[PDB]
Structure formats: structure tokens, C-alpha cells
Design a protein around this ligand. Structure first.
Ligand SMILES: C[S@@+](CC[C@H](N)C(=O)[O-])C[C@H]1O[C@@H](n2cnc3c(N)ncnc32)[C@H](O)[C@@H]1O
Ligand SMILES: O=c1oc2cc(O)ccc2s1
Length: 380
């Protein structure tokens, strides 16, 4: 009855995550001045370069050089010794206005509640009762290991740490009538960029004693737990110098770590009219409301849209057998309690607020009581 499941996470300085954070820093800069800004900002990072490419129609006056460099400074890339420096990197901008064909089909002359979806697509929401925050334990632990590395880098405990990191956690679970119960951590991988002076043995000892032990409860660790710590043996070259980064290349880290399902849409750099973000946040809100409301222990929600059409084209609820109610009854409860038009989701989840850079590392779900993490009281 037992099985293994693995999830990964990455740190703030992983090059794809740098791009997500810059794309959301650009979105927030626009929203601070123009709450109705139409933003579709992609970021690319490679050695010495941040390129912004995409489409923005906004009344805001944004200094892209300052926004980008301040985001890179926050991450910690502040010297050529680390492979990247916010003060001296190249910031290239290839931003145009939003296509007038998209604008006319989606939002021009439309009542806000009746704005069309900004694109077609499918999106999923997922929730599981295995943690209080209703997230899979594998991805929660993977994110916490990266957050711990950033904390020890920033407080000077492990001054040899650099911002680029990856983690991976494999948990052994038991099945329980469709729900899943974590038993133990089977394997942990940690890879983190480091300075040229620290030895491999010091790093491996610190990753076990100051990182893993400070994050994973001992009840999940045993003599058989496998540790792959700095498995490549050397990671001095990192950040965009070691690997090109792009916005929207960590969409599973951003969501459920392989659990549930994904429709393919990236979140970062997009305003609420892009249902890839707003409907995915609403779908998480629905899933978490069903679990916290005691209707099921685990649930997958699918929604889909057509460009220019406000209402979803389809809504589906899958409860893995963890509810006494049928999936059709859960679907009727969802339809009676939620309005998944983007122009209504924006009001319910306050999606014009400039809080998006905060979502762009450590996952968009299970953290900080964001509006989509506060369950809705269901009437039925
Ligand atoms: C291994 S690289 C991807 C493959 C790479 N583009 C290549 O040319 O082979 C992917 C991610 O792994 C991490 N990474 C980079 N250099 C690494 C190293 N020496 N050891 C371990 N992980 C590393 C970084 O987080 C990087 O973004
Ligand atoms: O410190 C952290 O705590 C959590 C909790 C989560 O549920 C997900 C991600 C993180 S990163």
C-alpha cells in the first residue's frame, strides 16, 4: 500500500526564478500607478543580461532599469564574483503595446464584470488535507529547504552560499481511501551555488546539520534516508551564467510539485485578465474551500476558457474518492458558490493589488494567507 512521490523546488537565484521575480516586479510597478495596466512581460536571463520581451499597455511611468536592478539586488546578485551583478548587468527592453486585436476582443468597451478571458486555456486547482495549508508535503519541504538556504546566506551563518539553488524531496506515503498519508522522507537532494574557498565536506555537513535538520522533522528521517548533497561535486558557476533562465519555466514548482495536474499556463508577468493566472488562483481557492469546508480530503478542479468569452467553457471536480458526495454534487456546490469570470475573480481575490513579486518564489500556493488561500464559506 505504500508509494514514493517526488517534488522539487528552486531558490530565489535560480535563473528561471530570477525571471519570474523580475516579470512580477515589472507587473507590480505598473499596478502601483495604473490598477488597470495590461501586462504580459516575459524575462530572459543569461550571463550579464536581463531582457524584457512582451506587451504592456499602461498609463504608468516605469523606470525598467531601476525595477529590474532592484529585483536582482533583492535576490543577492551584487558582485561579479557571484557570477551576476545588478549594478553592472545589461538590461535590454523589447516591450510593445498590447495587440489592438487582443484588446478589442478581450476588454475594450466591456463592463469589468463581463471582460472576456485574455486567452483560451485550461487551469487546475488542487488541495490535500495532508498539511494544514492543504499542500503536498513533498513540495512544502522542498520550498522550505530553499527558504532555509536563503535565510542562512542572508544572516551570514553560511557565507559561502550563493543565491542559485535546487532541492528535491521524495516522500514515502500510504494510501487511505483516496487520501494520502506521509510516512517518511525517502530521499533529499540539495544543490546550491557556492564560493571557491569552501570544501565539499564542509558544505555537505552544513547542508545536513544546518539546513535539513532545521527544516524536516526528525520523525520523517531515519537511518535509511538517502541524501544527495552537492551531488555534482562543484557548483561555483551559477545563476544566469551557468544556465539560461526564462519566465514561466518553473510552473510545477509554482504550483503543486507534480501532484494534481497542470494546464500549462505560466503566472508571472501577467495581469488578472490573463486567466492563466487569475483562474488558476481561483481554482486553488475553490479546491482549498472544498477541503477546509470538510467536503473532501483531496480534490482536483479543472476550469477552461476561450479568448473573449467571460464564463468558463468547462468546470470539473475530481475528489479521488474522498467525499461522501458525488463529484456531480460537488460541481453543483461549486457552481452555486463561485463566479469564475475573470472580471469577478479580480474583485473576490483583489487581483489589481501589487503583491505579485511576493508570489514569484517559494510557490504561489500554501503561503502567507493570500486571498486565494482564505477559504470561502460554502452554502448548500
Ligand atoms: C544543470 S543546469 C541545466 C543544464 C545546463 N543548461 C547545461 O548546459 O547542461 C539547471 C539548473 O541546475 C543548477 N546548476 C547549475 N550548475 C550546477 C552545478 N554545477 N551543479 C549542480 N546544479 C547546478 C542551476 O540551478 C541551473 O539553473
Ligand atoms: O517557508 C516556507 O513555508 C512554506 C509553506 C508552504 O506551504 C509552501 C512553501 C513554503 S516556503
Amino acid at each position: 500500500g505504500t508509494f514514493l512521490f517526488t517534488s522539487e523546488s528552486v531558490g530565489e537565484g535560480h535563473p528561471d526564478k530570477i525571471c519570474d521575480q523580475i516579470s512580477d516586479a515589472v507587473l507590480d510597478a505598473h499596478l502601483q500607478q495604473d490598477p488597470d495596466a495590461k501586462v504580459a512581460c516575459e524575462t530572459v536571463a543569461k550571463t550579464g543580461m536581463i531582457l524584457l520581451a512582451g506587451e504592456i499597455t499602461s498609463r504608468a511611468a516605469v523606470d525598467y532599469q531601476k525595477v529590474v536592478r532592484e529585483a536582482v539586488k533583492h535576490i543577492g546578485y551584487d558582485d561579479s564574483s557571484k557570477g551576476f551583478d545588478y549594478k553592472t548587468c545589461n538590461v535590454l527592453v523589447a516591450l510593445e503595446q498590447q495587440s489592438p486585436d487582443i484588446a478589442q476582443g478581450v476588454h475594450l468597451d466591456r463592463n469589468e464584470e463581463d471582460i472576456g478571458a485574455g486567452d483560451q486555456g485550461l487551469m487546475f486547482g488542487y488541495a490535500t488535507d495532508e498539511t494544514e495549508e492543504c499542500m503536498p508535503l513533498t513540495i512544502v519541504l522542498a520550498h522550505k529547504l530553499n527558504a532555509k538556504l536563503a535565510e542562512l546566506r542572508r544572516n551570514g551563518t553560511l557565507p559561502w552560499l550563493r543565491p542559485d539553488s535546487k532541492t528535491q524531496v521524495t516522500v514515502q506515503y500510504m494510501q487511505d481511501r483516496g487520501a494520502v498519508l506521509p510516512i517518511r522522507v525517502h530521499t533529499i537532494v540539495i544543490s546550491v551555488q557556492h564560493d571557491e574557498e569552501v570544501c565539499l565536506d564542509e558544505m555537505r555537513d552544513a547542508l545536513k546539520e544546518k539546513v535539513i535538520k532545521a527544516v524536516v522533522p526528525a520523525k520523517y528521517l531515519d537511518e535509511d534516508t538517502i541524501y544527495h548533497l552537492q551531488p555534482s561535486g562543484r557548483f561555483v558557476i551559477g545563476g544566469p551564467q551557468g544556465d539560461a533562465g526564462l519566465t514561466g519555466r518553473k510552473i510545477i514548482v509554482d504550483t503543486y510539485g507534480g501532484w494534481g495536474a497542470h494546464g500549462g499556463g505560466a503566472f508571472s508577468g501577467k495581469d488578472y485578465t490573463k486567466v492563466d493566472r487569475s483562474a488558476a488562483y481561483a481554482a486553488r481557492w475553490v479546491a482549498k474551500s472544498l477541503v477546509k469546508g470538510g467536503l473532501c480530503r483531496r480534490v482536483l478542479v479543472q476550469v477552461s476558457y476561450a479568448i473573449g468569452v467571460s464564463h468558463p467553457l468547462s468546470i470539473s471536480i475530481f475528489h479521488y474518492g474522498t467525499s461522501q458526495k458525488s463529484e456531480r454534487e460537488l460541481l453543483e456546490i461549486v457552481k452555486k458558490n463561485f463566479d469564475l469570470r475573470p472580471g469577478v475573480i479580480v474583485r473576490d481575490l483583489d487581483l489589481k493589488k501589487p503583491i505579485y513579486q511576493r508570489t514569484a518564489a517559494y510557490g504561489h500556493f500554501g503561503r502567507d494567507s493570500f486571498p486565494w488561500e482564505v477559504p470561502k464559506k460554502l452554502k448548500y
